[PDB]
Design a protein around this ligand. Structure first.
Ligand code: F6C
Ligand code: CLA
Ligand code: CLA
Ligand code: CLA
Ligand code: CLA
Ligand code: CLA
Ligand code: CLA
Ligand code: CLA
Ligand SMILES: CC1=C(/C=C/C(C)=C/C=C/C(C)=C/C=C/C=C(C)/C=C/C=C(C)/C=C/C2=C(C)CCCC2(C)C)C(C)(C)CCC1
Ligand SMILES: CC1=C(/C=C/C(C)=C/C=C/C(C)=C\C=C/C=C(C)/C=C/C=C(C)/C=C/C2=C(C)CCCC2(C)C)C(C)(C)CCC1
Ligand SMILES: CC1=C(C/C=C(\C)CCC[C@H](C)CCC[C@H](C)CCCC(C)C)C(=O)c2ccccc2C1=O
Ligand SMILES: [Ca+2]
Lengths: 80, 44, 43, 147, 135, 163, 751, 42
C-alpha cells in the first residue's frame, strides 16, 4: 500500500509504465501534453516500491513519486 | 638386453588395439611400448 | 600517425602523471640543499 | 571522543606514573600513540586471565574482548546490506516449510530487517563495542598500575 | 615564551650532536638547527615570539601562499579560458598545454591580478547566477 | 524415467519428489514418527515425543557438565537441565498455541492450508500435545535419571554380578 | 578436423583510437559529461564481452591480451634476475648461505631512508628479501651474477617477443573462431607440449646443471672450483667422479635409457624422499626423478583427446554420455539429459572457462603453499624462517583471490552467457532448479560450524576467565582430539604400502628432526585440541565464503524477490527500496562480500600457520638435541582462547614491528601503521552511501560556482557499486599490508 | 574463598534472586510479553 502520485509535468513519454514490474501504472488520455497521455496508478496496492518507475521518468525532478507507506504482504513481495 | 624383446607386447597391441573406435585417419605401437616398458620394468 | 599520438600524450592522465614526475624538484632540491630543511632553517 | 579521551588518558597516565617525559617526547608522532599508549598499557589488561591464573581484571579483560566482538558484529550490519539477507532468509523460509517434524510456523513472515534499521542496529553495536572496549581498557589500564 | 632557548645553549641538543653519524644527513642539516628555538628536550621547535621570528614565520607562508595561488590562479584562468571557447567539455579531458602554459605565465603576477579581478567586480559570481537547491 | 519428480505431480509447487522425502522407506519412517502417526490422540503424540527427548537430554550434562567430576551430583545437573529445557519448551508451545490459533491462523495452520508436514491445526489438538510433551519429557528425564544414578547397581545386574 | 584458419590484417595499427579513449563503449565514446565517465572508462576497459557481440572478435582480444600479459610477467621476471645480478649480495650468499642474509633491492641515499639498508652480513647493506629468489637460483645452478644478468637480458628480449606476438595476432594474422573452438586440440598441446615437454626440459636442466652444481656446493668448493654448467657437458669426464654408476658420453652414455638398463641411472635419479640434511631442501636427485616421472606422465596425458588423426577421445560425447541410463545407481539422480549441452557451455563462453580456470588455479596456489613448507624443495629454504612464512602467506592470498574470481565469472556466466535452450534439464539446470536446498543446507552447515568452532573459543575464553581450566576445551580439560588426522599422521609414517621410500616424506608427518644451521628445518607437527578447534575455524570460514559466493552464482539469474535479476545485469547496486529494501542483491555484491570472507578465512589460515611454526616447528637446536621453539609451545595452551590469540599472538609477536623505529626494520613499522590507516579509511566507503556524498559535492560545487572556477566535467560522487568496490579494495589492501608488515618485521628480526 | 557468600545482611537473598530475575522469571516474562505483542485486534 504505497502511494504512486503522478504530477502534471508528465510528457506522456510512456516510459514509467514499461519499467513497472507489477503493472501498477497505465496510461489514460489527457490534454496537457503533445502525447495527450498521462500516467495513472490504479493498482497501487500492487506497488512493490522498487521506484523503477522513477528511474525512467525523464522530466527533470520527475513527475511520478513512489511514497513508501504502509507495507503489506504484497507490497513487500513475499512468496511465503 | 639380449632377451627382453618387448615386441610381443606391441604385437599384442596391434592385434588388439586396432579394434578401437575410428581405427583410421598407428598408436598401438606407441601403446605397446607403454605396456611393454611398464611390464619389463615391472618384473625385473 | 604522429598527430593523434601527441594529442594522446597531452590528454588527461599523462599530463597529470608527467606533472607528478616533473614535480620531482622535491627530490633534486632536497638532495643538495642539505636535505634537512625545517622552517627556521631555510632563508 | 576517542581522541579526546585517548589524549586525556595518556596525558594523565604519564603524570600519574611519573613518566611525563614519555608523553612529551612521543605524542608528536603516531607510533608513540600506538606503542606507548595502546600497546604499552594493554599488557596488564590482556593478562587479566592467562593460562596460569586469573586476577581482578579478568572481567575487564573479558569485556575488552566482548567489545571487540560487539564492534566487529557492527560491521556486518554496516557493510553487508539488506537484499543479501532477504535472499538468504527466503531460502531458510523454504527450508522450514519443507522439513518434517518442524511444527512451528511464523505468525509474521521473517524478513531481513530494513535499511534504516540495520544502520541503527549496526550503529548500536559500533557504539557498544566502542564503549565496552575503551571502558575496559581505561579501567584496567589505570586500576592495575595503581590502586 | 622563555622556556625555549636556542640550540646554541641547550644541554639536551649538544648530546644530539655528539652521537650523530654523518652520511649526508645529521651534520649539514643539524648545524642549521642550532639557530632554532630549542626546547628542554633537544628538539627544534616553531615558536611565535615577536619580530625576532616575524620574518621566519613569513618566509614559508609567503612562499606557500604565492605558489598555492599560482596553482589556483593558473588552474582557474585556464577554466574560463575554455568556457569562453565553448569547447570546455573536451578541453578538460585533453589538456591544451599551450593554452595552459600561457595561463601559467598569467599566474606569476597573480596577487595583483586578483585585486583587479575584485576591483572590477569580476572575480566572484553574483548570487542569482549560481545554480542552487530549493531553499 | 527420472527419479526426481515434481512434488506430487505439480511442477509449480516449491518442492521436489526426492528419495529423501518421497521414498517408500523414508515416507514409512517419517509418517510413523509420533508427530505423524495416523491414529494417535495429540496426547500420545506428545507423550511419545516427550519421553524420547527427556531421556537423551540428561546425557550431555552428566558427563561433560560442570558436575561431572563427582557421581551423585552429576546426575542432578543433568536431570534439571532436562527439566529446564522441557519446561521452557512446553512454555514455548503453550504460547505458540495461544498466538497462532486466534481465528484464522496466518500460514500453514489456516483452515484451507492442506499441509501434511504439520497436522495439529486446531488448539484442541495443541493442548493435549503440550501435556504429552511435558509429562513425557519429565518421565523420560526421570527414567534416564534413575537409570544413571543406579548405574553401579545396574552395571552389576547386566554383568551377572548379582548371581 | 583441426586446422589453422586466420584473417589477414583485420585491425589497422594506428593511434586514431588512443586519442579518443572510451571508444570501446558507445556510451563512453560520446563525451565526458561527468566524472562518472572517467571511472566507467576503467571499469569497462577489459570487459570485451560488452565492447563487441561476436565471439570471433571477442576471442581475438582475449588471445592478444594474454600476450601483453605474458610480456608484463617477463618484464617482472627480468627485474628479479637483474636485481639479483647487480643489486644483491647473491655472490656472498652463495658462499655462506647461513650467516649471510639474502638481500636485493638496495635503497638510494635520500630522505634519510638509507637506514633501510640494514646490515646483511659480509658488509652488504640492503633490504632482506623474503621472496626466496636466492634459494631458487641455487637450486637452478646459478653461481655467479653474470648468469643472473644474462637471464634478465634473456627475459627482456623474451618480453619483446610477447608484445610482438600480441600485436601480430590482433593486427596482422588474427585467428578465426574455428581455431579457438577446438579446445580438444588445445588440451593435447598443453598437457603434452607445455606441461610434459616443460618438465622434460626442466629435468634435462636438473640432471645437467642443478644436480652437479648442488653436488659440489654441498662439499664446500667456494665458487672457485665450481665448473660453469656448460663445462659439465663439454667435459663429460667431469661427471664421472660424480654419479660414477652411469657412463656420461654423447652416445655411449645415453643408450642405457633406450636399452632399458635404467639401473645405471639410480645414482642421480633417486627415490630417497626426504630432506637433504646439509641444505634442508629436497634431494635434487629426487626432484629430477620427479620431473621425469611428471614429464612421462603428462606427455602420455596429452594423447588422450582426438585431433584430426581419428584416434583419441572426444570430450563432446564423453560429456553427452554422462546421462542416467549409464551411471552408478547411487548417483543416477542427475537427469536423463545429464551433461548434454555442457560442451557448448565451456566452448562458446570464456567466462565459463575463466570461472573454472581461476577456481583451480586458486586451489592449486593454496595446495602449493601447503606443500612448500612441509617439504621444502629449495636449499636453505626451510631455515630462512622469513621466507617460509612469506612464501606460504603469499600463495594463500594469491590462491584466495583467484578462487573468489572463479566465483565471480561463474556468476557473470549466469547473467550474460547462460542459455536456457542448450541447458534444458541438464546438469547445470537441475542445480538452479533446486538452489534453495543447496543454500539452506550450506547456510545450516555454515551455522553449525559457527557455533562448534568459534563459540567453543568463547567457551574457553569464559572458563579460563572464571578460573575453571579443567572445564575448558584444552588438552588438559575436555580434550577434542583430531582422531582422524592423527591417524593419517600415523599412516603416512609407517609406510616407509609404498616400501621403497625408506626416508619418510615430509618430516611434518612424523619421524626425525632436521636442523641445518642450528635452526630447525622441519619437525613433526603434532595435532592436539588446539588443532581440532583451529581446523574447524578453517572449515567454518571456507564454508561461509562458499555460501556467499555460491549464493551469488545460483541467485544471479533470479530470486523470489527479483524474478528478472538477469535483465538488471551483473553489476547493479539494487532494485530500489521496495520489498523492504533490495540493497546488494546483484551477483557482483556477493563477490564483494565474499572478498571479505576470503580475507577473514585466509588471514586465519596464515595466523594458524605463523603461530604453529613458531611454537611447534621452528626454533634452534643446541648441543644436546632439544629444540627451543620461537614462542615455545605457546600454541597448544593459549591458542584455544581468543584472548590468547590477542595477547600471545597479536600483542606479543608485534613487538618487532612496534619497536622497529630507528632500526633497519623501520619501513615495516610504517607499513604496519599504513595498513591501519587504509583499513580505517575503507570504512568511509563501506559504512556510508553516495546520497550524503553527492549532496556534499553540491555544497562544494557552489563554492566553485561562486568564484567562477567550476569544472565542466561535473563532479559526481562515486557510483554505489564503485563506492563499494573502493571500500573492499581498501579494506583488503589495508588489512593485508598490516599483516605483511607484521609477518616480515617479526621474521627479519630473527632470521 | 571457594564459594559465593555474603558478609552483608540477608545474604541468602542474592542466592535466590539472581536465579529469579535472570533465568527463572524472564522466560515467563518473555512469554507474557510475547502474548501482548501478538494478539488479534478483533
Ligand atoms: C518453533 C519454531 C521453530 C522451529 C520448529 O518448529 C524451527 C526449526 C528449524 C529446523 C527445521 C531447521 C534446523 C534446526 C537446526 O538445525 O538448528 C536449530 C535452530 C533453531 C532455531 C532451533 C529452535 C527450535 C525451537 C524454536 C525450540 C523452541 C525454543 C523454546 C521453546 C524457547 C523458549 C520459550 C520461552 C518463552 C523463551 C531450522 C533452521 C533455522 N532457524 Mg529455525 N525453527 C524455529 C524458529 C526460529 C526462530 C524464531 C529463528 C530466529 C532466530 C530461527 C532461525 C533459523 C535459522 C538461521 C536456521 C537454520 O540455519 C536452520 C535451517 O534452515 O535448516 C536447514 N528459527 N529451524
Ligand atoms: C584549479 C582547480 C581548483 C581550484 C582553483 C579549486 C579551489 C578551491 N577549492 Mg577545490 N578541488 C579541485 C580543484 C580546484 N579547487 C579538484 C580537482 C578536486 C578533487 C580532488 C577539488 C575538491 C575540493 C573540495 C572537497 C573542496 C574544495 C574547496 C576549494 C576552495 C577552497 C579550498 C582550497 O584551497 O582548495 C582545496 C583543494 C583540494 C581539496 C585539492 C585540489 C587541489 C588540486 C592540486 C587541484 C589542482 C589541479 C590542477 C591545477 C589542474 C577553493 C576555491 C573547498 C571548498 O568547498 O571551499 C570553501 C572544499 O571543501 N575543492
Ligand atoms: C606445444 C605447443 C604449445 C605450447 C608450448 C603452448 C603454450 C602456451 N599457450 Mg597455446 N595453443 C596451442 C599450442 C601450444 N601452446 C595450440 C595447438 C592451440 C590451438 C588450439 C593453442 C591455443 C592457445 C590459446 C587460446 C592460448 C594459448 C596460451 C598459451 C600460453 C599459456 C600461458 C601459460 O600457461 O604459461 C606460460 C608459459 C610460457 C611457457 C613460455 C612462453 C614461451 C612461448 C610463448 C611458448 C614456448 C615456445 C617453445 C620453445 C616452442 C603458453 C605459452 C594462452 C596465452 O597465453 O595466449 C598467449 C592462450 O590464450 N594457447
Ligand atoms: C629433455 C631434455 C634433455 C636434453 C636437451 C638432454 C641433452 C643431453 N644429454 Mg640428457 N638426460 C635427460 C634429458 C635431456 N638431456 C633425462 C631426463 C635423463 C635421465 C634419463 C638424461 C640422462 C643423460 C645421460 C646419462 C647423458 C645425457 C647426455 C646428454 C648430452 C648428449 C646426449 C644427446 O645428444 O642427446 C646432451 C646435451 C650425455 C652427456 O653428454 O653427459 C654430459 C650423457 O651420457 N643425458
Ligand atoms: C585471469 C584472471 C581474470 C580476468 C581475465 C578477469 C577479467 C575480467 N573481470 Mg575479473 N576477477 C578476478 C580475475 C580475472 N578477471 C579475480 C581473481 C577476482 C576477485 C577479486 C575478480 C573479480 C571481478 C569482479 C567483481 C568483476 C570482474 C570483472 C572482469 C571483467 C572486466 C575487467 C575490468 O573491469 O577492467 C579492469 C579493472 C581494473 C584494472 C580495476 C583495477 C583496480 C584493482 C581492484 C586495484 C588493485 C590493487 C593493487 C594491486 C594495489 C573482465 C572480463 C568485472 C565485470 O564486470 O565482469 C564482466 C567485475 O564486475 N572481476
Ligand atoms: C565478529 C563479528 C561477527 C559475528 C559474530 C558474525 C556472525 C555471523 N555471520 Mg557475519 N560478518 C561480519 C562479522 C560477524 N559475523 C562482518 C564484519 C561482515 C562483513 C563482510 C560479515 C558478513 C557476513 C555474511 C555475508 C554472512 C555472515 C554470516 C554470519 C552468521 C554465520 C552463522 C554462524 O556462524 O553461526 C554461529 C554464530 C556465531 C558465531 C555468533 C556468535 C555466537 C556466540 C558465541 C554464542 C552466543 C551465546 C548465546 C546465544 C548468547 C545469547 C544470550 C542471550 C542473553 C541473548 C553468524 C551469526 C553468514 C550467515 O548468515 O550464515 C547463514 C552470512 O552469509 N556474515
Ligand atoms: C582512517 C579513516 C578515515 C579517514 C582518513 C577519513 C577522512 C576523511 N573523512 Mg571520514 N569517515 C570514516 C573514516 C575516515 N575518514 C568512517 C568510518 C566514517 C563513517 C562512515 C566516516 C564518515 C565521514 C563523513 C560523513 C565525512 C567524512 C569526511 C572526511 C574527510 C574530511 C576530513 C579531512 O578533510 O581531512 C583531510 C584528508 C585526509 C586526512 C585524508 C588523507 C589524505 C590522503 C592520504 C592524501 C594522500 C593520497 C595519496 C594517494 C597518498 C576526510 C578525507 C567529511 C568530508 O568529506 O569533508 C568534506 C565528511 O562529510 N567521513
Ligand atoms: C535501578 C537501581 C538498581 C540497580 C541497577 C540494581 C541492581 C542490582 N541489584 Mg538491586 N535494588 C534496588 C535498586 C537497584 N538494584 C532498590 C531500590 C532495592 C531495595 C528494594 C534493591 C534491592 C536488591 C536486592 C535484595 C538484591 C538486589 C540485587 C541487585 C543486583 C542483581 C540484579 C537483581 O537481582 O536485582 C533485583 C531487583 C530488585 C530487588 C528490585 C530493584 C528494582 C528497582 C527498585 C527499580 C529498578 C527498575 C528500573 C528503575 C526501571 C528500568 C527498567 C528498564 C527501563 C531498563 C544488581 C547489581 C541482588 C544482589 O544483591 O546482587 C548480588 C539482590 O538480591 N537489589
Ligand atoms: C533416526 C534413526 C536412528 C536414530 C535414532 C535415534 C535418534 C535414537 C534414539 C533414541 C532414544 C532417545 C530413545 C529413547 C527412549 C526412551 C524411553 C524408553 C523412555 C522412557 C520412559 C519412561 C518409562 C518413563 C517413565 C516414568 C514416568 C512416565 C513418570 C514417572 C517416572 C517414570 C520414570 C516411571 C538410527 C540412526 C539409530 C537408526 C534408526 C533411525
Ligand atoms: C598571519 C598569522 C596568522 C593568522 C592568520 C589569520 C588569523 C588569518 C586570517 C584571515 C582571513 C580573515 C581570511 C580570509 C578570507 C576571506 C575570504 C572571502 C577569502 C578568500 C579567498 C579567495 C577569494 C580566494 C581566491 C583565490 C585565490 C587567492 C587564488 C586561487 C583561486 C582562488 C579563487 C581560490 C597565523 C597565527 C595563522 C600564523 C602567523 C601569523
Ligand atoms: C568519500 C566518498 C565519495 C566521494 C569520493 C570521491 C569524490 C573520490 C575522490 C577522488 C579524487 C576526486 C581524485 C581526483 C584527482 C584529481 C584529478 C586531481 C589530480 C590533479 C593533479 C594530478 C594535478 C563517494 O562518492 C562515495 C560513494 C559511495 C559510498 C561512499 C563514498 C565515499 O566515502
Ligand atoms: Ca569439570
Amino acid at each position: 500500500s504505497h502511494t504512486v502520485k503522478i504530477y502534471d509535468t508528465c510528457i506522456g513519454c510512456t516510459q514509467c509504465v514499461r519499467a513497472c514490474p507489477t503493472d501498477v501504472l497505465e496510461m489514460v488520455p489527457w490534454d496537457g501534453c503533445r502525447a495527450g497521455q498521462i500516467a495513472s496508478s490504479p493498482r497501487t496496492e500492487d506497488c512493490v516500491g522498487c521506484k523503477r518507475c522513477e528511474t525512467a521518468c525523464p522530466t527533470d525532478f520527475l513527475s511520478i513519486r513512489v511514497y513508501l507507506g504502509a507495507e503489506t504482504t504484497r507490497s513487500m513481495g513475499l512468496a511465503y | 638386453x639380449x632377451x627382453x624383446x618387448x615386441x610381443x607386447x606391441x604385437x599384442x597391441x596391434x592385434x588388439x588395439x586396432x579394434x578401437x573406435x575410428x581405427x583410421x585417419x598407428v598408436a598401438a605401437m606407441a601403446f605397446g611400448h607403454v605396456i611393454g616398458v611398464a611390464i619389463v620394468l615391472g618384473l625385473t | 600517425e604522429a598527430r593523434y599520438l601527441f594529442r594522446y600524450l597531452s590528454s588527461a592522465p599523462v599530463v597529470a602523471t608527467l606533472a607528478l614526475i616533473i614535480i620531482s624538484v622535491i627530490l633534486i632540491v632536497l638532495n643538495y640543499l642539505f636535505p634537512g630543511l625545517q622552517y627556521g632553517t631555510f632563508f | 571522543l576517542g581522541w579526546v579521551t585517548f589524549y586525556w588518558h595518556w596525558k594523565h597516565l604519564s603524570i600519574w606514573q611519573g613518566n611525563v617525559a614519555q608523553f612529551n617526547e612521543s605524542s608528536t608522532y603516531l607510533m608513540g600513540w600506538f606503542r606507548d599508549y595502546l600497546w604499552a598499557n594493554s599488557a596488564q589488561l590482556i593478562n587479566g586471565y592467562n593460562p596460569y591464573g586469573t586476577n581482578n581484571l579478568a572481567v575487564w579483560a573479558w569485556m575488552f574482548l566482548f567489545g571487540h566482538l560487539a564492534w566487529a558484529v557492527s560491521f556486518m550490519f554496516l557493510i553487508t546490506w539488506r537484499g543479501y539477507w532477504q535472499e538468504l532468509i527466503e531460502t531458510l523460509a523454504w527450508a522450514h516449510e519443507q522439513t518434517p517434524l518442524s511444527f512451528g510456523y511464523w505468525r509474521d513472515k521473517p524478513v531481513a530487517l530494513s535499511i534504516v534499521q540495520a544502520r541503527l542496529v549496526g550503529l548500536t553495536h559500533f557504539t557498544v563495542g566502542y564503549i565496552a572496549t575503551y571502558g575496559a581498557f581505561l579501567i584496567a589500564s589505570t586500576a592495575s598500575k595503581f590502586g | 615564551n622563555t622556556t625555549l632557548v636556542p640550540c646554541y645553549k641547550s644541554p639536551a641538543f649538544v648530546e644530539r650532536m655528539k652521537n650523530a653519524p654523518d652520511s649526508y644527513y645529521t651534520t649539514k642539516p643539524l648545524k642549521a638547527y642550532s639557530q632554532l628555538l630549542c626546547g628542554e628536550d633537544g628538539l627544534p621547535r616553531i615558536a611565535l615570539d615577536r619580530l625576532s621570528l616575524a620574518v621566519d614565520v613569513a618566509i614559508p607562508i609567503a612562499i606557500f601562499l604565492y605558489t598555492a595561488g599560482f596553482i589556483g590562479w593558473s588552474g582557474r584562468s585556464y577554466l574560463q579560458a575554455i568556457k569562453k571557447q565553448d569547447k570546455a567539455e573536451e578541453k578538460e579531458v585533453f589538456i591544451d598545454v599551450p593554452l595552459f602554459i600561457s595561463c601559467m605565465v598569467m599566474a606569476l603576477f597573480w596577487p595583483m591580478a586578483v585585486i583587479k579581478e575584485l576591483l572590477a567586480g569580476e572575480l566572484v559570481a553574483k548570487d542569482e547566477e549560481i545554480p542552487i537547491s530549493v531553499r | 524415467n527420472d527419479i526426481i519428480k515434481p512434488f506430487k505431480g505439480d511442477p509449480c509447487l516449491g518442492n521436489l519428489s526426492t528419495p529423501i522425502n518421497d521414498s517408500p522407506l523414508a515416507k514409512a519412517f517419517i509418517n510413523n514418527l509420533p508427530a505423524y502417526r495416523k491414529g494417535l490422540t495429540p496426547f500420545m503424540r506428545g507423550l511419545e515425543i516427550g519421553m524420547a527427548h527427556g531421556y537423551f537430554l540428561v546425557g550431555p550434562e552428566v558427563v561433560i557438565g560442570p558436575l561431572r567430576e563427582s557421581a551423585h551430583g552429576a546426575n542432578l545437573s543433568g536431570l534439571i537441565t532436562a527439566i529446564y529445557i522441557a519446561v521452557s519448551a512446553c512454555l514455548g508451545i503453550s504460547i505458540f498455541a495461544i498466538t497462532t490459533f486466534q481465528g484464522n491462523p496466518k500460514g500453514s495452520y489456516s483452515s484451507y492450508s492442506k499441509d501434511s508436514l504439520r497436522p495439529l491445526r486446531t488448539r484442541e489438538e495443541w493442548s493435549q500435545l503440550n501435556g504429552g510433551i511435558f509429562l513425557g519429557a519429565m518421565g523420560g528425564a526421570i527414567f534416564a535419571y534413575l537409570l544413571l544414578e543406579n548405574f553401579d547397581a545396574l552395571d552389576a545386574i547386566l554383568r551377572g554380578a548379582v548371581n | 578436423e583441426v586446422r589453422v584458419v586466420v584473417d589477414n590484417d583485420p585491425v589497422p595499427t594506428s593511434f586514431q583510437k588512443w586519442s579518443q579513449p572510451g571508444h570501446f563503449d558507445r556510451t563512453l565514446a560520446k563525451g565526458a559529461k561527468t566524472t562518472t565517465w572517467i571511472w566507467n572508462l576503467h571499469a569497462n576497459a577489459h570487459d570485451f564481452d560488452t565492447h563487441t557481440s561476436d565471439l570471433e572478435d571477442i576471442s581475438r582480444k582475449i588471445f592478444a591480451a594474454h600476450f601483453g600479459h605474458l610480456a608484463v610477467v617477463f618484464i617482472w621476471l627480468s627485474g628479479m634476475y637483474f636485481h639479483g645480478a647487480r643489486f644483491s649480495n647473491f655472490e656472498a650468499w652463495m658462499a655462506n648461505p647461513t650467516g649471510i642474509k639474502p638481500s636485493a633491492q638496495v635503497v638510494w641515499p635520500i630522505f634519510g631512508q638509507e637506514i633501510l639498508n640494514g646490515d646483511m652480513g659480509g658488509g652488504f647493506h640492503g633490504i632482506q628479501i623474503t621472496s626466496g629468489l636466492f634459494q631458487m637460483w641455487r637450486a637452478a645452478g646459478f653461481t655467479n651474477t653474470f648468469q643472473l644478468y644474462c637471464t634478465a637480458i634473456g627475459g627482456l628480449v623474451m618480453a619483446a617477443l610477447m608484445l610482438f606476438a600480441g600485436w601480430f595476432h590482433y593486427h596482422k594474422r588474427a585467428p578465426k573462431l574455428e581455431w579457438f573452438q577446438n579446445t580438444q586440440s588445445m588440451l593435447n598441446h598443453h598437457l603434452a607440449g607445455l606441461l610434459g615437454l616443460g618438465s622434460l626440459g626442466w629435468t634435462g636442466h636438473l640432471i645437467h646443471v642443478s644436480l652437479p652444481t648442488n653436488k659440489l656446493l654441498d662439499t664446500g668448493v667456494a665458487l672457485k672450483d665450481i665448473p660453469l654448467p656448460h663445462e659439465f657437458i663439454l667435459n663429460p669426464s667431469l661427471m664421472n667422479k660424480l654419479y660414477p654408476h652411469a657412463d656420461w658420453g654423447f652416445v655411449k652414455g645415453v643408450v642405457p635409457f633406450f636399452t632399458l638398463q635404467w639401473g645405471h641411472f639410480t645414482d642421480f635419479l633417486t627415490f630417497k624422499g626426504g630432506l637433504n640434511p646439509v641444505t634442508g631442501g629436497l634431494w635434487l636427485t629426487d626432484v629430477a626423478h620427479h620431473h621425469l616421472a611428471i614429464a612421462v606422465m603428462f606427455i602420455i596425458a596429452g594423447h588422450m583427446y582426438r585431433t584430426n588423426w581419428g584416434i583419441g577421445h572426444s570430450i563432446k560425447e564423453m560429456l553427452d554420455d554422462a546421462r542416467t541410463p549409464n551411471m552408478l545407481p547411487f548417483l543416477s539422480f542427475i537427469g536423463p539429459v545429464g551433461h548434454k549441452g555442457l560442451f557448448e557451455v565451456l566452448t562458446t563462453s570464456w567466462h565459463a572457462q575463466l570461472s573454472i580456470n581461476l577456481a583451480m588455479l586458486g586451489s592449486l596456489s593454496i595446495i602449493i603453499a601447503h606443500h612448500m613448507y612441509a617439504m621444502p624443495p629449495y636449499p636453505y629454504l626451510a631455515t630462512d624462517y622469513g621466507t617460509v612464512v612469506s612464501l606460504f602467506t603469499h600463495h594463500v592470498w594469491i590462491g584466495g583471490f583467484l578462487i573468489v574470481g572463479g566465483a565471480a565469472h561463474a556468476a557473470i556466466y549466469m547473467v550474460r552467457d547462460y542459455d536456457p535452450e542448450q541447458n534444458f534439464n541438464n546438469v547445470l539446470d537441475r542445480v538452479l532448479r533446486h538452489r534453495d536446498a543447496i543454500i539452506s543446507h550450506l547456510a545450516w552447515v555454515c551455522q553449525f560450524l559457527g557455533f562448534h568452532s568459534f563459540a567453543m573459543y568463547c567457551h574457553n575464553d569464559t572458563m579460563r576467565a572464571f578460573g575453571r581450566p579443567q572445564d575448558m576445551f584444552s588438552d588438559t580439560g575436555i580434550q577434542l582430539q583430531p582422531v582422524f588426522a592423527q591417524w593419517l599422521q600415523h599412516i603416512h609414517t609407517m609406510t616407509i604400502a609404498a616400501p621403497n621410500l625408506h626416508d619418510p616424506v615430509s618430516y611434518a608427518f612424523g619421524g626425525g628432526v632436521v636442523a641445518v644451521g642450528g635452526k630447525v628445518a622441519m619437525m613433526p607437527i603434532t595435532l592436539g585440541t588446539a588443532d581440532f578447534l583451529i581446523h574447524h575455524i578453517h572449515a567454518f570460514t571456507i564454508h561461509v565464503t562458499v555460501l556467499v559466493l555460491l549464493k551469488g552464482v545460483l541467485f544471479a539469474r533470479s530470486s523470489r524477490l527479483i524474478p528478472d535479476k538477469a535483465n538488471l545485469g551483473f553489476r547493479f547496486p539494487c532494485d530500489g527500496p521496495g520489498r523492504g529494501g533490495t540493497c546488494q542483491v546483484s551477483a557482483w555484491d556477493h563477490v564483494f562480500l565474499g572478498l571479505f570472507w576470503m580475507y577473514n578465512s585466509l588471514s586465519m589460515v596464515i595466523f594458524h600457520f605463523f603461530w604453529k611454526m613458531q611454537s611447534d616447528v621452528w626454533g634452534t637446536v643446541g648441543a644436546d638435541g632439544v629444540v627451543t621453539h620461537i614462542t615455545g609451545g605457546n600454541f597448544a595452551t593459549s591458542s584455544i582462547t581468543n584472548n590468547g590469540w590477542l595477547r600471545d599472538f597479536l600483542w606479543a609477536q608485534s613487538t618487532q614491528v612496534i619497536t622497529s623505529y630507528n632500526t633497519s626494520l623501520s619501513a615495516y613499522g610504517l607499513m604496519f601503521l599504513g595498513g591501519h590507516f587504509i583499513f580505517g579509511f575503507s570504512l568511509m566507503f563501506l559504512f556510508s552511501g553516495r546520497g550524503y556524498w553527492q549532496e556534499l559535492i553540491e555544497s562544494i560545487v557552489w563554492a566553485h560556482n561562486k568564484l567562477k572556477v567550476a569544472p565542466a566535467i561535473q563532479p559526481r560522487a562515486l557510483s554505489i557499486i564503485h563506492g563499494r568496490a573502493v571500500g573492499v579494495a581498501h579494506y583488503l589492501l589495508g588489512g593485508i599490508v598490516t599483516t605483511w608488515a607484521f609477518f616480515l618485521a617479526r621474521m627479519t628480526a630473527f632470521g | 574463598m571457594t564459594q559465593l557468600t555474603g558478609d552483608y545482611a540477608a545474604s541468602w537473598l542474592p542466592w535466590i534472586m539472581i536465579p529469579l530475575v535472570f533465568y527463572i522469571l524472564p522466560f515467563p516474562v518473555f512469554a507474557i510479553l510475547f502474548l501482548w505483542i501478538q494478539k488479534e485486534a478483533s
